[PDB]
Amino acid sequence: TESLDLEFESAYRGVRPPWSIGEPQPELAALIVQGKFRGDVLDVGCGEAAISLALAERGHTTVGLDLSPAAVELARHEAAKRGLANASFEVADASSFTGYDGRFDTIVDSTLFHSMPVESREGYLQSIVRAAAPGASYFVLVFDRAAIPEGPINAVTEDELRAAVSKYWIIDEIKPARLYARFPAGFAGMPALLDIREEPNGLQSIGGWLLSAHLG
Ligand SMILES: Nc1ncnc2c1ncn2[C@@H]1O[C@H](CSCC[C@H](N)C(=O)O)[C@@H](O)[C@H]1O
Ligand code: NA
Numbered sequence: 001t002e003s004l005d006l007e008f009e010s011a012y013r014g015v016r017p018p019w020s021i022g023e024p025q026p027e028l029a030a031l032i033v034q035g036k037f038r039g040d041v042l043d044v045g046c047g048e049a050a051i052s053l054a055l056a057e058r059g060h061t062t063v064g065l066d067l068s069p070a071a072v073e074l075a076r077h078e079a080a081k082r083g084l085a086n087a088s089f090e091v092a093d094a095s096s097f098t099g100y101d102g103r104f105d106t107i108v109d110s111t112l113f114h115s116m117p118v119e120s121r122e123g124y125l126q127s128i129v130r131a132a133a134p135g136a137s138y139f140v141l142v143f144d145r146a147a148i149p150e151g152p153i154n155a156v157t158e159d160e161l162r163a164a165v166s167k168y169w170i171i172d173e174i175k176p177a178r179l180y181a182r183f184p185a186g187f188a189g190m191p192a193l194l195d196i197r198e199e200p201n202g203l204q205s206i207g208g209w210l211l212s213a214h215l216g
C-alpha cells in the first residue's frame with residue numbers, strides 16, 4: 001500500500017505548495033484558449049483550483065474535487081475573493097466518487113493522475129466516466145516516468161498512459177509537456193537528483209505528458 005494524503009494536507013496547510021502557481025498550468029491554459037473546454041467542468045484533484053477559477057470567470061459552471069480538506073478551503077477562499085458563485089468544491093476521493101452522473105462536458109486532471117496509486121486508476125477512470133456527459137472531453141497533465149522515478153509519485157510512460165486511459169476514453173493526442181512549479185532553493189539537492197528546468201518568471205518545469213481524449 002501507499003498514501004500521500006497526509007503530505008498533501010500538510011502542504012496545503014503550510015511556504016506554499018510549489019505546484020500552486022496561482023494560474024492554470026500553462027499547457028492546459030493553451031487548450032482553454034483553443035476553445036477545448038466546454039460546458040460544465042470537473043477539475044478532479046483540484047487543489048487550490050486555479051483552472052476551475054479561471055473557467056468560472058469565463059462563464060463555466062465548475063466543480064472541483066480534492067481529497068484534501070485544506071485544498072478545498074483554499075479553493076473556496078480564492079473563489080470568495082473573486083466573487084464567484086458558479087465554482088463549487090467538495091472533499092471527495094477521485095478514485096471512488098458518485099453524485100454527478102452524466103454531469104460534465106469537460107473533465108480536467110491537472111497533475112492528479114500520478115498522485116494516486118497505480119491500483120486506484122481503474123476506479124478513478126470509471127468514476128469520471130460515470131460523471132461524464134455524452135461526448136465529454138478529458139484532459140490529463142501528468143509527470144513522465146523518464147523524469148520522475150518509481151517512488152511516492154506514479155509518473156507514466158506514454159504507452160502506460162495510453163493503455164490506462166484508452167480502456168475508458170477515445171484518445172485524440174498524447175504529446176510531451178511541461179509541468180510548472182515554483183520550487184524552493186536547492187530543491188532535490190546540490191547537485192540536484194532530478195532534472196528541473198529553469199523557466200521565465202522564476203518558475204521551473206519538469207517533463208510530462210499532455211493527453212486529450214473524448215468519451216466515445
Ligand atoms: N484520490 C484522490 N482524490 C482526490 N484528490 C486527490 C487524490 N489523490 C490526490 N489528490 C489531490 O491531487 C492533487 C495533486 S497536486 C495538483 C493540484 C491542482 N490540480 C493543481 O494543478 O495545482 C492534490 O491536491 C491532492 O490532494
Ligand atoms: Na493520492
Ligand code: NA
Nearest residue numbers: 175176177178
Ligand atoms: Na508542446
